[PDB]
């Protein structure tokens with residue numbers, strides 16, 4: 001029982017969407033790609049419709065499209081973006097070439113929310129950790145967490161997403177030198193610090209400067225962590241730099257809530273085996289007033305075996321088409 005579509009141009013781009021979506025207006029200045037705001041006549045709420053660009057232009061684009069659809073269909077959590085609809089005007093695989101995604105209309109990102117109160121930071125970071133506990137439990141690593149990938153509405157309700165299109169300021173040092181899930185926790189540490197102080201914690205100009213700033217705070221690796229670098233070039237570099245002491249975070253986040261400081265000490269550790277996880281962090285005393293261990297769920301298992309597959313462009317397209325058809329809309 002297929003719906004009725006209607007076509008229209010919008011800023012040198014064609015849009016064929018269910019009549020159920022109306023009053024489409026472009027949002028961003030193309031920053032988010034081809035995205036419009038909309039009114040959903042089924043529900044009566046604003047939505048965001050994104051039309052992918054050249055989704056099957058190449059083998060790599062076909063796989064990235066399939067990956068994005070598969071991940072979005074899996075996410076069912078209050079602090080993670082979710083898929084409200086996915087559709088295509090095509091009536092059969094032979095004419096399938098465009099893919100539309102429908103999500104909630106997000107309010108503003110965390111860059112667009114002056115420092116916050118300590119209570120505001122607790123709530124926002126709490127919600128990020130809660131969604132991270134959920135994606136991490138599915139063996140899903142975000143990898144690109146940063147204020148522009150956090151959406152927050154007027155109730156300060158937060159959702160994690162990934163718009164795609166600097167990342168380096170938030171990036172774990174191990175995956176910037178190539179020597180697990182807690183790369184995301186490092187980024188939370190950087191975000192949390194910024195909310196507290198009002199300043200980018202590690203505003204590095206490139207990768208070597210980014211590492212220089214990081215070690216000035218957390219200190220040069222010790223032999224405990226040195227014993228775990230396999231990359232021989234990485235070891236030589238770190239041992240050649242000037243030995244800089246670990247700073248005491250209380251002298252750097254002066255005046256901040258000492259629970260917040262203690263949590264920063266547990267997130268912004270160089271050794272990834274010692275970094276706090278999302279689930280452990282939810283139990284930190286700093287979130288004492290939001291922590292609810294009975295309402296911090298994990299995710300269903302996520303089959304990502306496809307990621308190790310080499311398929312042709314038309315096969316990835318077919319699989320994307322499967323996921324479009326099999327899609328069941330939520331409540």
Ligand SMILES: CS(=O)(=O)N1CCC[C@@H](NC(=O)[C@H](CCC2CCCCC2)NC(=O)c2ccc(CNC(=O)c3cnn(-c4ccccc4)c3N)cc2)C1
Pocket residue numbers: 027028032035048049050064067068071072075080081101102103104105106107108109135140141142151160161162163164165
């Ligand atoms: C690293 S890559 O391999 O994966 N891959 C490359 C990089 C991007 C990756 N994104 C993903 O896979 C995620 C889902 C998977 C991701 C996994 C980790 C946990 C978060 C979700 N795609 C998205 O997040 C996404 C998809 C569609 C949409 C559509 N709504 C909008 O655009 C929208 C809604 N509101 N607004 C807005 C906000 C404020 C003001 C005005 C407008 C918009 N502009 C938005 C986001 C894919």
